[PDB]
């Protein structure tokens, strides 16, 4: 939890009480565990919705959906049960409450089970299942000169009638919301990303939406891959972005521009960025994933535990900030090494909050945190992004001005800022490590075996912000060679392995004053010519499994070559710059590199030309 931030235990395990209604009687009952936080703003009233697991944290036990609401930004709260289970048995439960806010209404979708003690994904059929929608209506009043609010919960309605018996190649079994908070699309539709099972017990995500305020529901035709559960979605630039949990694998993120009719993996932005554990081989988690506008910039906030412990412990809830280009680790929201899996982040009236689980010995509370430090950090980073984008965009490029330098898809930029061991990302997300580097205006001058900079890709580890590079990228830099090498020496490239010996696409230079563009494993053909001391503009582009290298805005011989065998998807380890940064690699690159730009797409010809013409103008040095 960042400095300045603070929290309270709001839904306190084995302590907080809820109004338990049964057989027409209501008793204030202590709840063992609270899980599945959903925190929203309904017309000025903060509402925290969750599972009240009365007797045990075990999923298949007695659970009602609890709501707490506050009209003073979380200082004080009222408590209610928003949805009660069927009371059919000792383990009846309404589960995975998923919340949409629209106007003054809360739409809450829950699965409902009567007696099963088994996990829902293990059920061979739906005999124990129903899917219910309850609507809470929030009204504010000022009887008494002080703001008050109340929420009237309607009886739940089954939406089972809207669940088709079959979907393409399958027979449906059950579905649930993805938990947390869902959305109202810009066209007014209520949109729930849902997790669905078929009779083979596979799980997959779908979009389940309503065009008539929840009276009828439809499923989008398309779906995620199997294995994607607890989906969470937001709308971004006219598309749904569906961010899914994949146990034991990296999280898959999809985009859909037609209400779920078609799903495309967001390989160029957010898919596979977030791993569920350091080695991405443990269970995943529910995640808060929202689009908000902070100081005029639309961005997305995403949370997920880092889970260093493994299994479902899911310690170290981390918050991420992204404008769909750069992905910034705001930091750890939870405290120390506590288990802290599920969460919900709310941005309301320029304050940031998070309601999240803490788990000791399988007894769970929800803490309500005021993310003061986090918002401060976020605003600082966004200012940096807006400022560098503005700086680059405002440059009058050489003819009257030429086309603007493009910042669309610009993800990282290594320029003037650098410390003894790092070359700093102007966008503040991923620095490059360096060796044998001397600072020069807008870059670094390298020399000696082991010299160079390493801009990590898979080397980022659990969370891989540059994963998009495995699908498409453009890497741009200005370079100057100061010494003729003994053989061929590296200047710039994307490496598939840690050494730099296995390259996806790179540029080297040789003793015959020729460039050696390297296209994957293709035998290298030296080409062109360069002179010592002259600065050259280098662009490496990769898209559709094809690599190109440009020098001074012109593509080198060999460009347009396949760099990825059509079968697999690359796993780039890092970009190397100005050397391999590997003492074990035999080369000595004596070169200066300035202004390294990384884009998450293949730049077009005009864009490349503009960057070439504007090389002397883009540095961060004076700014």
∠ CA 112-49-312, nearest 5°, is: 75
Q: Sign of dihedral through CA atoms 311, 312, 313, 319?
A: positive
Sheet holding 363-370, edge to edge: 6-11, 363-370, 351-360, 343-348
Structure obtained using? X-ray
Cα–Cα dist 330/343, whole Å? 15
What are the tokens at 269?
């932005």
In a 3-state reduction of DSSP, which class is residue 484? coil
Closest CA to 614 of 460, 406, 471: 406
Strand partners, 300: 291, 322
What are the tokens at 252?
């898959």
| Domain 371-623 architecture | Sandwich (2.60)
Q: In Å, what is the CA distance from 320 to each residue of 40, 183, 294, 305, 347?
A: 19, 19, 14, 11, 14
DSSP 71: S
The contacts of residue 43 (CB under 8 Å, 6+ apart) are 103, 104, 138, 140
Q: Are 485 and 491 in contact (CB under 8 A)?
A: no
Closest CA to 505 of 451, 452, 576: 576
Cα–Cα dist 466/521, whole Å? 22
Please name the helix (run of DSSP H) or strand (run of DSSP E) that holds residue 21, with its range, or none.
strand 17-22
PDB resolution in Å: 1.6
Closest CA to 213 of 154, 139, 272, 271: 154
- What DSSP string describes 507-521? EEEETTS-EEEEETT
What are the tokens at 457?
């890709």
Q: In Å, what is the CA distance from 614 to each residue of 385, 397, 608?
A: 20, 6, 10
The 10 Å Cβ neighbour count of residue 116 is 17
Burial class of residue 455, CB neighbours in 10 A (0-12, 13-18, 19+): buried
Q: Sign of dihedral through CA atoms 181, 185, 190, 196?
A: negative
The 10 Å Cβ neighbour count of residue 138 is 20
Cα–Cα dist 29/19, whole Å? 6
Q: Are 524 and 563 in contact (CB under 8 A)?
A: no
The contacts of residue 297 (CB under 8 Å, 6+ apart) are 323, 382, 385, 386
Q: Are 443 and 422 in contact (CB under 8 A)?
A: no
Domain ranges of the chain: 1-370, 371-623
Q: SS in 3 state form for 177-207?
A: ECCEECEECCCCCEEEEEEEEECCCCEEEEE
Name the CA radius of gyration of the chain, rounded: 27
Q: Are 260 and 167 in contact (CB under 8 A)?
A: no
Residue 245 has φ and ψ, to the nearest 5°, of -85, 130
- What DSSP string describes 403-464? SPPP-TTEEEEEEEEE-SSEEEETTSS--EEEESEEEETTEEEE-STT-EEEEESGGGTTB-
The 10 Å Cβ neighbour count of residue 383 is 12
DSSP 3-state helix, strand, coil percentages of the chain (rounded to 5)? 10, 50, 45
Cα–Cα dist 256/271, whole Å? 13
Closest CA to 471 of 387, 589, 571: 571
What are the tokens at 196?
């669905």
In a 3-state reduction of DSSP, which class is residue 8? strand
Strand partners, 298: 293
Cα–Cα dist 234/243, whole Å? 9
Q: Sign of dihedral through CA atoms 79, 84, 89, 94?
A: negative
Burial class of residue 539, CB neighbours in 10 A (0-12, 13-18, 19+): buried
State CA 230 to chain mean position distance. Answer: 14
Size of the chain, expressed as the number of residues it contains: 623
Residue entry with tokens 């124990």? 128
Q: Are 23 and 52 in contact (CB under 8 A)?
A: no
Q: Are 139 and 148 in contact (CB under 8 A)?
A: no
Residue entry with tokens 């809820």? 18
Q: How many helices (H) and strands (E) does the chain have?
A: 2, 46
Q: Are 156 and 74 in contact (CB under 8 A)?
A: no
Q: Which fold has domain 1-370?
A: Neuraminidase (2.120.10)
Q: In Å, what is the CA distance from 395 to each residue of 381, 442, 619?
A: 21, 16, 11
446 CB-side CA count, 13 A: 33
Cα–Cα dist 431/419, whole Å? 10
Q: In Å, what is the CA distance from 324 to each residue of 8, 115, 237, 273, 279?
A: 32, 43, 10, 12, 24
State CA 512 to chain mean position distance. Answer: 46
Q: In Å, what is the CA distance from 81 to each residue of 27, 29, 44, 55, 244?
A: 11, 11, 20, 16, 28
CATH topology identical between 1-370 and 371-623: no
Strands 554-555 and 503-510: unpaired
Cα–Cα dist 260/246, whole Å? 19
Closest CA to 355 of 51, 137, 100: 51
Cα–Cα dist 137/477, whole Å? 56
Residue entry with tokens 């919301």? 177
Burial class of residue 122, CB neighbours in 10 A (0-12, 13-18, 19+): exposed
Cα–Cα dist 79/15, whole Å? 13
Strand partners, 373: none
Cα–Cα dist 288/30, whole Å? 27
Q: In Å, what is the CA distance from 89 to each residue of 82, 112, 114, 123?
A: 19, 12, 6, 18
Q: What is the dihedral of CA 278, 279, 281, 285, to 10 degrees?
A: 30
52 CB-side CA count, 13 A: 30
């Amino acid at each position: 939890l960042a400095p300045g931030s603070s929290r309270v235990e709001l839904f306190k395990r084995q302590s907080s009480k809820v109004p338990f209604e049964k057989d027409g009687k209501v008793t204030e009952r202590v709840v063992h565990s609270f899980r599945l936080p959903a925190l929203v703003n309904v017309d000025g009233v903060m509402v925290a919705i969750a599972d009240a697991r009365y007797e045990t944290s075990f999923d298949n036990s007695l659970i009602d959906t609890v709501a707490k609401y506050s009209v003073d930004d979380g200082e004080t709260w009222e408590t209610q049960i928003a949805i009660k289970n069927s009371r059919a048995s000792s383990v009846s439960r309404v589960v995975d409450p998923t919340v949409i806010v629209k106007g003054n209404k809360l739409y809450v979708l829950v699965g409902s089970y009567n007696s099963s003690r088994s996990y829902w994904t293990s059920h061979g059929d739906a005999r124990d299942w129903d899917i219910l929608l309850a609507v809470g209506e929030v009204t504010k009043s000022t009887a008494g000169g002080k703001i008050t609010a109340s929420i009237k919960w309607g009886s739940p309605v089954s939406l089972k009638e809207f669940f088709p018996a079959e979907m393409e190649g399958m027979h449906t079994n059950q579905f649930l919301g993805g938990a947390g908070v869902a959305i109202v699309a810009s066209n007014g539709n209520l949109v729930y990303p849902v997790q669905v099972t078929n009779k083979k017990k596979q799980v997959f995500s779908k979009i389940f939406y309503s065009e008539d305020e929840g009276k009828t529901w439809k499923f989008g035709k398309g779906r995620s891959a199997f294995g994607c559960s607890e989906p969470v979605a937001l709308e971004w630039e006219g598309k749904l972005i569906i961010n899914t949990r994949v146990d034991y694998r990296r999280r898959l993120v999809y985009e859909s521009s037609d209400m779920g009719n078609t799903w495309l993996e967001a390989v160029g932005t957010l898919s596979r960025v977030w791993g569920p554990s350091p080695k991405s081989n443990q269970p995943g988690s529910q995640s808060s994933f929202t689009a908000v506008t902070i100081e005029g910039m639309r961005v997305m906030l995403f949370t997920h535990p880092l889970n260093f412990k493994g299994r479902w412990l899911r310690d170290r809830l981390n918050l991420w900030l992204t404008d769909n280009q750069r992905i910034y680790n705001v930091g750890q929201v939870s405290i120390g090494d506590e288990n802290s899996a599920y969460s919900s982040v709310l941005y309301k009236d320029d304050k940031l909050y998070c309601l999240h689980e803490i788990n000791s010995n399988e007894v769970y509370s929800l803490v309500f945190a005021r993310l003061v430090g986090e918002l401060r950090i976020i605003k600082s980073v966004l200012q940096s992004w807006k400022n560098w984008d503005s700086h680059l965009s405002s440059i009058c490029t050489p003819a009257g001005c030429g086309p603007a330098v493009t910042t669309v898809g610009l993800v990282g930029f290594l320029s003037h800022s650098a410390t003894k061991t790092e070359w700093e990302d102007a966008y503040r997300c991923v620095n490059a490590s360096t060796a044998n580097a001397e600072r020069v205006p807008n870059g670094l001058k390298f020399a000696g075996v082991g010299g160079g900079a390493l801009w990590p890709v898979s080397q980022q580890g659990q969370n891989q912000r540059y994963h998009f590079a495995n699908h498409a990228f453009t890497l741009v830099a200005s370079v100057t060679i100061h010494e003729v090498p003994k053989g061929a020496s590296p200047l710039l490239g994307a490496s598939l392995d840690s050494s730099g010996g296995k390259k996806l696409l790179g540029l080297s230079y040789d003793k015959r004053h020729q460039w050696q563009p390297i296209y994957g494993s293709t035998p290298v053909t030296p080409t062109g010519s360069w002179e010592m001391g002259k600065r050259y503009h280098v662009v490496l582009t990769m898209a559709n499994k094809i690599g190109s290298v440009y020098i001074d805005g012109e593509p080198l011989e060999g460009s347009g070559q396949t760099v990825v065998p059509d079968e697999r998807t690359p796993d780039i380890s890092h970009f190397y710059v100005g050397g391999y940064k590997r003492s074990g690699m035999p080369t000595d690159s004596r070169v200066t590199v300035n202004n390294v730009l990384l884009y998450n797409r293949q730049l077009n010809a005009e864009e490349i030309r503009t960057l070439f013409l504007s090389q002397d103008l883009i540095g961060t040095e004076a700014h």
